[PDB]
Structures are given as structure tokens and as C-alpha cells.
Design an enzyme around this catalytic site. Structure first.
Site, PDB file in Angstrom:
ATOM      1  N   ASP B  25      15.133  47.750 -32.776  1.00  0.00           N
ATOM      2  CA  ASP B  25      14.872  46.807 -31.697  1.00  0.00           C
ATOM      3  C   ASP B  25      16.127  46.170 -31.160  1.00  0.00           C
ATOM      4  O   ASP B  25      16.557  45.113 -31.668  1.00  0.00           O
ATOM      5  CB  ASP B  25      13.849  45.782 -32.229  1.00  0.00           C
ATOM      6  CG  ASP B  25      13.348  44.884 -31.195  1.00  0.00           C
ATOM      7  OD1 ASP B  25      13.682  45.063 -30.001  1.00  0.00           O
ATOM      8  OD2 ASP B  25      12.613  43.964 -31.639  1.00  0.00           O
ATOM      9  N   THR B  26      16.731  46.744 -30.111  1.00  0.00           N
ATOM     10  CA  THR B  26      17.952  46.196 -29.582  1.00  0.00           C
ATOM     11  C   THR B  26      17.729  44.862 -28.884  1.00  0.00           C
ATOM     12  O   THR B  26      18.703  44.143 -28.650  1.00  0.00           O
ATOM     13  CB  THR B  26      18.607  47.196 -28.625  1.00  0.00           C
ATOM     14  OG1 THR B  26      17.754  47.517 -27.529  1.00  0.00           O
ATOM     15  CG2 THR B  26      19.028  48.457 -29.357  1.00  0.00           C
ATOM     16  N   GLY B  27      16.471  44.525 -28.561  1.00  0.00           N
ATOM     17  CA  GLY B  27      16.176  43.241 -27.976  1.00  0.00           C
ATOM     18  C   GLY B  27      16.041  42.110 -28.944  1.00  0.00           C
ATOM     19  O   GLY B  27      15.764  40.970 -28.530  1.00  0.00           O
TER      20      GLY B  27
HETATM   21  C1  LIG Z   1      12.202  37.348 -24.785  1.00  0.00           C
HETATM   22  C2  LIG Z   1      13.064  37.730 -26.009  1.00  0.00           C
HETATM   23  C3  LIG Z   1      13.700  39.113 -25.927  1.00  0.00           C
HETATM   24  C4  LIG Z   1      12.552  40.114 -26.146  1.00  0.00           C
HETATM   25  C5  LIG Z   1      12.419  40.697 -27.548  1.00  0.00           C
HETATM   26  C6  LIG Z   1      11.234  41.623 -27.603  1.00  0.00           C
HETATM   27  C7  LIG Z   1      11.122  42.572 -28.797  1.00  0.00           C
HETATM   28  O1  LIG Z   1      11.849  41.983 -29.975  1.00  0.00           O
HETATM   29  O2  LIG Z   1      11.964  43.762 -28.433  1.00  0.00           O
HETATM   30  C8  LIG Z   1       9.702  42.979 -29.158  1.00  0.00           C
HETATM   31  C9  LIG Z   1       9.564  43.918 -30.368  1.00  0.00           C
HETATM   32  C10 LIG Z   1       8.116  44.333 -30.735  1.00  0.00           C
HETATM   33  C11 LIG Z   1       7.139  43.149 -30.879  1.00  0.00           C
HETATM   34  C12 LIG Z   1       7.720  42.197 -31.900  1.00  0.00           C
HETATM   35  N1  LIG Z   1       9.034  43.631 -28.037  1.00  0.00           N
HETATM   36  C13 LIG Z   1       8.080  42.903 -27.237  1.00  0.00           C
HETATM   37  O3  LIG Z   1       7.818  41.693 -27.432  1.00  0.00           O
HETATM   38  C14 LIG Z   1       7.366  43.693 -26.150  1.00  0.00           C
HETATM   39  N2  LIG Z   1       6.117  44.159 -26.677  1.00  0.00           N
HETATM   40  C15 LIG Z   1       5.788  45.439 -26.722  1.00  0.00           C
HETATM   41  O4  LIG Z   1       6.542  46.326 -26.348  1.00  0.00           O
HETATM   42  C16 LIG Z   1       4.403  45.813 -27.315  1.00  0.00           C
HETATM   43  N3  LIG Z   1       3.665  44.743 -27.971  1.00  0.00           N
HETATM   44  C17 LIG Z   1       3.504  44.635 -29.292  1.00  0.00           C
HETATM   45  C18 LIG Z   1       2.685  43.468 -29.756  1.00  0.00           C
HETATM   46  O5  LIG Z   1       3.953  45.492 -30.080  1.00  0.00           O
HETATM   47  C19 LIG Z   1       3.608  46.459 -26.205  1.00  0.00           C
HETATM   48  C20 LIG Z   1       2.293  47.012 -26.773  1.00  0.00           C
HETATM   49  O6  LIG Z   1       3.352  45.522 -25.149  1.00  0.00           O
HETATM   50  C21 LIG Z   1       7.191  42.808 -24.911  1.00  0.00           C
HETATM   51  C22 LIG Z   1       8.565  42.463 -24.285  1.00  0.00           C
HETATM   52  C23 LIG Z   1       6.319  43.444 -23.848  1.00  0.00           C
HETATM   53  C24 LIG Z   1       6.811  44.780 -23.264  1.00  0.00           C
HETATM   54  C25 LIG Z   1      12.269  39.647 -28.620  1.00  0.00           C
HETATM   55  O7  LIG Z   1      11.219  39.006 -28.907  1.00  0.00           O
HETATM   56  N4  LIG Z   1      13.413  39.197 -29.271  1.00  0.00           N
HETATM   57  C26 LIG Z   1      13.396  38.170 -30.324  1.00  0.00           C
HETATM   58  C27 LIG Z   1      13.052  38.787 -31.658  1.00  0.00           C
HETATM   59  C28 LIG Z   1      13.087  37.798 -32.819  1.00  0.00           C
HETATM   60  C29 LIG Z   1      14.457  37.514 -33.386  1.00  0.00           C
HETATM   61  N5  LIG Z   1      14.665  36.362 -33.990  1.00  0.00           N
HETATM   62  O8  LIG Z   1      15.321  38.367 -33.309  1.00  0.00           O
HETATM   63  C30 LIG Z   1      14.703  37.407 -30.325  1.00  0.00           C
HETATM   64  O9  LIG Z   1      15.815  38.005 -30.222  1.00  0.00           O
HETATM   65  N6  LIG Z   1      14.659  36.079 -30.389  1.00  0.00           N
HETATM   66  C31 LIG Z   1      15.832  35.222 -30.476  1.00  0.00           C
HETATM   67  C32 LIG Z   1      15.955  34.667 -29.069  1.00  0.00           C
HETATM   68  C33 LIG Z   1      17.081  35.324 -28.287  1.00  0.00           C
HETATM   69  C34 LIG Z   1      18.199  34.334 -27.917  1.00  0.00           C
HETATM   70  N7  LIG Z   1      19.479  34.848 -28.386  1.00  0.00           N
HETATM   71  C35 LIG Z   1      20.546  35.089 -27.678  1.00  0.00           C
HETATM   72  N8  LIG Z   1      21.502  35.813 -28.283  1.00  0.00           N
HETATM   73  N9  LIG Z   1      20.693  34.687 -26.397  1.00  0.00           N
HETATM   74  C36 LIG Z   1      15.589  34.201 -31.522  1.00  0.00           C
HETATM   75  N10 LIG Z   1      16.562  33.785 -32.324  1.00  0.00           N
HETATM   76  O10 LIG Z   1      14.523  33.728 -31.683  1.00  0.00           O
END
Ligand SMILES: CCCC[C@H](CC(O)(O)[C@H](CCCC)NC(=O)[C@@H](NC(=O)[C@@H](NC(C)=O)[C@@H](C)O)[C@@H](C)CC)C(=O)N[C@@H](CCC(N)=O)C(=O)N[C@@H](CCCNC(=N)N)C(N)=O
Lengths: 99, 99
Positions: B25-27
Site C-alpha cells: 500500500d503505497t498510500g
Molecule cells: C486519505 C489517506 C490516503 C489514502 C490511503 C488509502 C489506503 O491506505 O491505500 C487504503 C488501503 C485499503 C483499505 C485500508 N485504500 C482505501 O482506503 C481505498 N479503498 C479501497 O480501495 C477498497 N476498500 C476497502 C474497504 O478495501 C475498495 C473496495 O473501495 C479508498 C481510497 C477507496 C478507493 C490511506 O488510508 N492511508 C492511511 C493508512 C493508515 C496509516 N496510518 O498509514 C494513512 O497513510 N494515514 C496517515 C495519514 C497520512 C498523512 N501523512 C502524510 N505523510 N502527509 C496516518 N498517519 O494516519
């Protein structure tokens, strides 16, 4: 190009006339853009991940250029902290993970 | 390996002696795994995703083998929808995005 993962993989995209920054997200099935008053027809959708679900507007056949590489497909518009480029468009630009 | 993105980039990991499946998960900044026991001490933390915030347990310095490549680092444990390997461990295994 090659993008390392020491920092968030943010790149410039072009969509609906506008340049934006977006996150290349191998964990996202779909592409999700911050609220943008795009013209065109849309349909309602819900998408989920950490924290639960949000409501978004689905627009089809939208051109999105990602770091100069053209793509066209479905874009979901709703309230997100970050614009997300998901696999539906990453595949079109030939993006892979490598290690 | 080189992993394309037509399907979710799911891989097998080993953690605390157990095999699990997880999404590359690069996101994600961090690695987040469904509720489980891990050895040692943890600290409460909150993280955010597309849908809002959840509470997790933070464990530091946890060995994780990801598709056969070793990492040692922070693992967050909590009610994530999908087990995800985030950038903190992806960088340790040398993972890049390429297009
Ligand atoms: C809006 C935030 C950026 C998006 C990503 C999304 C994702 O991690 O790739 C997740 C991984 C799978 C579900 C957990 N993907 C998703 O949430 C995506 N979901 C999906 O693809 C599927 N859904 C499901 C439920 O599987 C699909 C069926 O819809 C949605 C974007 C919709 C297309 C995400 O949630 N990142 C979090 C993961 C948790 C974490 N702690 O790493 C994050 O980095 N959060 C940081 C915030 C980022 C701020 N940081 C920064 N450097 N600026 C944090 N600390 O809380």
C-alpha cells in the site's frame, strides 16, 4: 521514472483543466479527487477504507494526465484530504511495484 | 519481484510466527494489521484513512517477512478493513514505483 517511498508519492496530475497534486496509491482500487466542481453527469457511490465510508460522485471517461502520461477513466469526487490515484489509472500508465 | 496492478497487490507475510495476507500500500504511511496478539509492549495511537480515524495499538521493532524479504519496524494493530504494508516497511524491502 522511478519513485521511492521515503516520502508520500505525490505527483502532479491534470484533470478537468486543473493541475493538482495526487498520491499514487497501490492500495486504492479507484481514483478519488478532492471536491471539484466538474461539469458533467455523475452518479452516487460510497467508498470505504480506514475509518469507514464516504459518499462520492462518480464521473466516467474523464481524462487524467499523471506526470505527463495520459489516462482516461472513472474519477470519484468527494471530501478527501488527499487526491488519490488508484489502480484503475495506475494500470493505464504502466505503473508497477518493484523490489 | 515486479508486481503489476491489474489485481490488488496482495502478498503473504510472516509476523509473530504466523502467516497472514497483506496489501502492498503505497498510500499508507504505516503498516496496519487486523487485531491480533503481538509480543511485547504497545502504545495507543489514532490513525486516519479515507473514512475517518480509528484507534490502534502501536508495536515497535517487530520483525515482519514480506514475500520473503525481511523488515523490522513499527506495526499498528487494530480494526483496519484490510491488512496493509505501508511505506515504513516498503522502504526497508527496497520497494519502488516505476512507470
Ligand atoms: C486519505 C489517506 C490516503 C489514502 C490511503 C488509502 C489506503 O491506505 O491505500 C487504503 C488501503 C485499503 C483499505 C485500508 N485504500 C482505501 O482506503 C481505498 N479503498 C479501497 O480501495 C477498497 N476498500 C476497502 C474497504 O478495501 C475498495 C473496495 O473501495 C479508498 C481510497 C477507496 C478507493 C490511506 O488510508 N492511508 C492511511 C493508512 C493508515 C496509516 N496510518 O498509514 C494513512 O497513510 N494515514 C496517515 C495519514 C497520512 C498523512 N501523512 C502524510 N505523510 N502527509 C496516518 N498517519 O494516519
Amino acid at each position: 521514472p522511478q519513485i521511492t517511498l521515503w516520502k508520500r508519492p505525490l505527483v502532479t496530475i491534470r484533470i478537468g483543466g486543473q493541475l493538482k497534486e495526487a498520491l499514487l496509491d497501490t492500495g486504492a482500487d479507484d481514483t478519488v479527487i478532492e471536491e471539484l466542481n466538474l461539469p458533467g453527469c455523475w452518479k452516487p457511490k460510497l467508498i470505504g477504507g480506514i475509518g469507514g465510508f464516504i459518499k462520492v460522485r462518480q464521473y466516467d471517461q474523464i481524462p487524467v494526465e499523471i506526470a505527463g502520461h495520459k489516462a482516461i477513466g472513472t474519477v470519484l469526487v468527494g471530501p478527501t484530504p488527499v487526491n488519490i490515484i488508484g489502480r484503475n489509472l495506475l494500470t493505464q500508465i504502466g505503473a508497477t511495484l518493484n523490489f
